[PDB]
Amino acid sequence: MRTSLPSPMFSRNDFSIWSILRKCIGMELSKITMPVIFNEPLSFLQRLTEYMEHTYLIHKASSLSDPVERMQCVAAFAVSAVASQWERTGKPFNPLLGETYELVRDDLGFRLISEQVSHHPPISAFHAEGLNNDFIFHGSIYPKLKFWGKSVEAEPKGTITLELLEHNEAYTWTNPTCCVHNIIVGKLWIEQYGNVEIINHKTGDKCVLNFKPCGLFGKELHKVEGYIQDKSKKKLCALYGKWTECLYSVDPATFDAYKKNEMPVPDSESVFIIPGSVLLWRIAPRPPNSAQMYNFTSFAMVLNEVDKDMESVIPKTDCRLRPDIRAMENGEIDQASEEKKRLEEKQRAARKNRSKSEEDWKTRWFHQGPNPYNGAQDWIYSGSYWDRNYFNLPDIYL
Amino acid sequence: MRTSLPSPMFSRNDFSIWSILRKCIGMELSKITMPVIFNEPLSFLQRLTEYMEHTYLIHKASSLSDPVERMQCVAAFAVSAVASQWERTGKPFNPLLGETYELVRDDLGFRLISEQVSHHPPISAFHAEGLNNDFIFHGSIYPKLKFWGKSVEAEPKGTITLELLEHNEAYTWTNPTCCVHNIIVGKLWIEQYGNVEIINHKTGDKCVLNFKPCGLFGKELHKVEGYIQDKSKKKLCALYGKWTECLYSVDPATFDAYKKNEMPVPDSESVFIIPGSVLLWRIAPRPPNSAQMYNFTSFAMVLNEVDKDMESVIPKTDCRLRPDIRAMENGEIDQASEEKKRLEEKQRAARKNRSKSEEDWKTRWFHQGPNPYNGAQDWIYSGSYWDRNYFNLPDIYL
Ligand SMILES: CC(C)CCC[C@@H](C)[C@H]1CC[C@H]2[C@@H]3CC=C4C[C@@H](O)CC[C@]4(C)[C@H]3CC[C@]12C
Ligand SMILES: CC(C)CCC[C@@H](C)[C@H]1CC[C@H]2[C@@H]3CC=C4C[C@@H](O)CC[C@]4(C)[C@H]3CC[C@]12C
C-alpha cells in the first residue's frame, strides 16, 4: 500500500482567484476567455477612441489667442474624454496582439489610429490628428488592475499628450483611476477619481484637476474641482463640475466665497452653477436606445460600423473585421463565444510559434521612444498608416 | 452614419462574476475549466471517501451492547468523518457525469462504492459496507455554495445514514457547513460549523453536535460541543473537542461544573481534557511528507493508487483511470490541464448529443427513493456493483 504520492506537489506562489480574475477582467493574456455575456460589442481600442467624442473643444482651444483660455478648453477636453464611462459596465473585448482600429470623423474634424502594441504589459497606443492639422493628440494606456474589498481599480497608465500646432505648445497629463464597484456580486457601477495635472510645456501654465472619490456619505460622487495657475503658481481660474455632466469656470475669489456656504449608488445632485460662471463643456445626452444598447453614446454606436467601401481601404487588422465582436453586435451570442475562443487560441498558437521560431513581435504603426515633453517611456506613432499600401500585416482573424 | 446597433443587447439577469466562480469552484457544470493549479490530485468522489478513514469507530459501536455507548461511538465517527479538511484547500477534481470510485480497505474492514449521479444539482452518492456485514453507511452530497464577504460556504446537502445491522438500528444526520475563507485573495483556510443532530431511529436517542463558528476573537475555532439525550430528552453525556483533534465524553454535571471557570488564522489551543473524561477519538497525525503532498492524510494518499491487478477488476468509470488526475499526481501539470480540457469537452459533447438524441441519462449504481428513516429524497445504492460483470458502462475517459 503506497505511503506517498509519486511526485511532490507544485508550488503555486501567490497565485489566487484574483490572479485569474485580474487577467480575465483586464487586458492581459488569459488562458480563460472572458464570457461574451460580460462584454460590450466594442474592442478596447474602440472604447479608448471615445476620448475623441468632444474634439470640438480642441478646435476651440486652437482658435483662441489667450493661453489661459486655451487651458480652460484643454481641461474641459481632458474631463470630456473620460466622461462616457458611467454605466458602461460591459467589458470591451480584449484586443489581439497587433489589432488596430481607425476612425475618421469628417464632421468632427479628426482621424485616429490605434494599435494593441503589447500584452506584456497590455498597452493600447493611439494617435489622433485634426483634419486641418490644428492638433495632435496621442497617448497609450496600460490598464493596471488592483482588487480592494468589493471593487476593482483600473489605473490607466501612460502619458496623454495634446499638441496645439498653431501655438507651438504641448500639454501632458495622466488620466484618473477608474473604479468598478461590486465586481464579484451585485450591481456593477463606475467611479473615477484621482489628481490630474495638465502641464503647458511652452508657458508653464498648469491645470490641477481633482476627480473626487465618493467620500463617506457619497456627497462627492463624480465631482471635479480644480484650478488653473500660471508659471508663478498664481491661481487664475477655478474649475468645477462633475465628469458625468459638465465643467464650468469661475473667478477663484467668487468660487471660494460660494464654497463656505453590496455598495449602492449614492444620490448625486447636479451641482449648482455659481453665478458668473462660464460654461466650458456639457455632456451629450445619451440617446433613447442607449439603455437597450449597452448604454452606448451615439458616438460609440458609430465606432464599429462597417460598409463595403470601408472594407476596401481599412487594413486587415482593423477590428471592424473582428468576427466575434461583429457576431455579438448582430445578436449572435453563441457565434460570438465560438469565434472568440477561436481567435484567442489562434493568437496563443502564433505566440508559441513565435517562441519556438525565435522571432520577435514587430508592432506595425508605433515605436517606443521618450515622450519629448516629460521624458517618460512612450509609444509614438511611426507615420505612414494613412498612406494605405499595407504590406505583410499580421493575420489575426479567422 | 448609423444611429443605433443592428440588434438590442441581451439581458443577462443576475449573472455575475460570482455566478462563474460558483460553477467553477463548486461541482456544477462549468464552461470554464478550473485551472489544475487550484486542484489536488483527487476526485471529489475520493475526497468524500475520506469519511471512512476512522471506520474502526463503527466496528467498535457494533460491538457494544449499551445503545448510549454506541451513540458515543457514532458521534465520534460523525466528527471523525469530516476531520481531514484542515488545510485541504486544493479543490478535488469535478467528477464527470457517471464517474465512479471504489475503495476496498481489508485492513479497515470496509468497502465503498460511489457515483456522480447528476450535475443538476451536482450530487455524489456513496455506499460503504463492513466486510463482515456489521454496518452500512451511505449518503449523498450536493455541495451548495454561497459567497459571503471574503469567504465561500459549501453546505453539504444530503442525508447521512449509518445502519448497525447487528442491532437493527439506523442513525441519520447531516454534515456541518464548510467555510473557505479568503476565497479571492490571501491565504485559503477552512472552517466547519453548524448544528448536527444524530437520531437513533430504533431508540429515539439523539445526539446534538454543535460545530462552533470562530466567534469574534476566534476563541471557538474548530470547537465541537454537544450531548447525548434519550427519548425522554434527558441529557446523558456531554461531548466536547475539536473536529481537528479529538472528541471526549464526560458526565454532563462534571462538564457544566468545569464550564463556569485578509482574514488571518486565529491561534487555537488544544483544549484541556476535563478530568474523568473518556477518550472517544483522536485524529491521526499527518505524515511528514503531507505538506509537500497537498496536505493529504496517509489515508488520502492511498485513494488514487492503481496497479495492473486493480485495472483488471475495476470498471472503466473508476476515477483511478481518469487521465488528468493521474497526470497531475505524476507531476505533469500541462498534460493534466490538457487532458482535463479534453475530458470536459467530451462530456459537454455527449450531453448535447443526448439532448438532440432525446435520450435521458441513466445512473448505473444508484436510484432515487425515499430515505426509509426520515422520508427525505435520497439516492440509494442499487446493488450488484461488486459482482463485477460490467456491461455497457459509460465511456467517459479519453
Ligand atoms: C467583467 C466585468 C465584470 C468587468 C468590466 C470591467 C470594465 C468595466 C473595465 C475594465 C477595463 C476598464 C477600462 C480601463 C481603462 C480605461 C481608460 C480610462 O481613462 C477610462 C476608463 C477605462 C475605459 C476603463 C473603463 C472600465 C473598464 C472597461
Ligand atoms: C478554487 C479554490 C480556491 C477553492 C477550493 C474549494 C474547496 C477547498 C472546497 C470546494 C468543495 C468543498 C467540499 C464540499 C463538500 C464537502 C463535504 C463536507 O462534509 C466536508 C467538506 C467538503 C469536502 C468540502 C471541502 C472544501 C471543498 C473541497
Author numbering:
A (entry chain A), B (entry chain A): 533 to 793, 815 to 951
Which passages does the manuscript contain on this structure?
Members of the OSBP/ORP family vary in length: the short ORPs contain primarily a conserved OSBP-related domain (ORD) that can bind and transfer lipids such as sterols, PIPs or phosphatidylserine (PS), whereas the long ones often possess additional functional domains for ligand binding and/or membrane targeting. The OSBPL1A gene (homo sapiens) encodes two proteins: the long isoform ORP1L (residues 1–950) containing the ANK (ankyrin repeat) domain, the PH (Pleckstrin homology) domain, the FFAT (diphenylalanine in an acidic tract) motif and the ORD, and a short isoform ORP1S (residues 514–950) containing only the ORD. Here, while we cannot rule out its cholesterol sensor function, our structural, biochemical and cell biological data suggest that ORP1L is a bona fide cholesterol transporter. Here, our results suggest that ORP1 is a unique sensor of lysosomal PI-bisphosphates, and that PI(4,5)P2/PI(3,4)P2 allosterically regulates cholesterol transport by ORP1.
To further illustrate the mechanisms underlying cholesterol transport by ORP1-ORD, we solved two crystal structures of ORP1-ORD (524–950 or 534–950) in complex with cholesterol. To accomplish the lipid transport function, the ORP/Osh proteins were expected to adopt the open state when extracting lipids from or unloading them onto the membrane, and the closed state when transporting lipids between two membranes. Therefore, the open conformations of ORP1-ORD may represent certain important states when ORP1 exerts physiological functions (see below). The 2Fo-Fc map revealed continuous electron density for cholesterol, which binds deeply into the central tunnel in the core. In the 2.6 Å structure, the 3-hydroxyl group of cholesterol forms direct or water-mediated hydrogen bonds with Tyr583 and Gln724 at the bottom of the binding tunnel. The hydrocarbon tail of cholesterol also forms hydrophobic contacts with Ile557 and Met559 in the lid region, as well as Ile549 from the lid of a symmetry-related molecule. Consistently, structural analyses of the open cholesterol-bound ORP1-ORD revealed domain swapping between symmetry-related molecules, effectively generating dimers or trimers. We thus constructed a model of ORP1-ORD monomer based on the 2.6 Å cholesterol-bound structure and performed molecular dynamics (MD) simulation. Significantly, the lid moves toward the tunnel entrance within 20 ns, and the monomeric ORP1-ORD conformations throughout the remaining simulation are similar to the crystal structures of closed Osh proteins.
